[model samples]
Target: MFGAIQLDGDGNILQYNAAXGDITGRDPKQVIGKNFFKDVAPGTDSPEFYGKFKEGVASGNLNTMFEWMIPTSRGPTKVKVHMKKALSGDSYWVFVKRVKLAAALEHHHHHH
Candidate 1:
């Protein structure tokens, strides 16, 4: 399954998707307008991805891919993220999806 989160330049979620709720075990309504890292993801899971994200936004050049490990009761899973800056100041869109490292590697070597 896949999950999506939208963040402002400050890293506040503006619109969280239904799949995000399913992955994180939170209600979509509750998560729609909050901080994905603080209100949701924690630990080693969120820091790597979120740290670079905040820095990119602060620097005013925030069009990059974010990838990290996410913690779950099941275990630590990996994800790939794409963040885009909104036309409005201090606004961003971050989309996250569950994926494995193997899949990521394979995707880069596609031939078809």
Candidate 2:
């Protein structure tokens, strides 16, 4: 299932989709109003991640795509994500698609 999170400028979640809960093993109620990078994708939250978000928001690029890891009860799962900043700077629409390392590597090799 695909996951979706809508966050504000400070990374606070404004909305979360049920598919996100299914992927993260978290309840929507628990995820709402939480920090996305810190609370949801802590495993892959780094300076680069924050910098990317800030740069996108500040520069008005809005359509930045990156990869992150979701910290689940079972383990860390890798996901491809895109965070699009709203024109008003009020919020961001984040979309996530779960991915496995093996499948990614295979695709990379075939493309190369």
Candidate 3:
């Protein structure tokens, strides 16, 4: 299981957990304090993911979901991204959790 990721409206990768690294196949230290969308996703897909975050922020949404087909280190993945807006210490928080779908796991080999 992965923990939450909090970022600003600018798409910075404010904070992440060790579980985020395990799920994304990234180094935990490398991910924190970076742009969660930009650093995690490259190319056109990153924009797609970033758009969801932007919409959530613009709308001040909670438990918003954005599902997409993406290519990961694992393989082509169908992921459900959950976004929530929060406030802490006078700053806004964009909390995100990326979940890999079970159906996609069946479709893509784990070795991938």
Pick the TM-score winner: 2
- Give the least accurate 10-residue stretch of model 1, judged by summed lDDT: 103-112
List the candidate 3 regions with Cα displacement exceeding 4 Å.
44-48, 87-112
Whichever of 1 and 2 has more TM-score, that candidate is 2
* Cα lDDT over the full model 3: 0.59
Clashes of 3: 1
TM-scores of all predicted structures: 0.68, 0.74, 0.63
What are the lDDT scores of the predictions, listed in order?
A: 0.68, 0.73, 0.59
Candidates, ranked, lDDT: 2, 1, 3
Q: For this target, which candidate reaches the highest lDDT against the unseen true structure?
A: 2
Candidate 3 vs. true structure, TM-score: 0.63
**Clashes in each model (backbone N, CA, C under 3 Å)?**
1, 0, 1
Candidate 2's C-alpha runs over 4 A off are 71-76, 87-89, 100-106, 109-112
**Per-residue lDDT for 30-82 in model 1, tens only?**
86676666766545334456677777788876787756566779997677767
Per-residue alpha-carbon lDDT of candidate 2 for residues 63-112, written as tens digits (9 for 90 to 100): 87766555567886777878777656677888889766565333533221
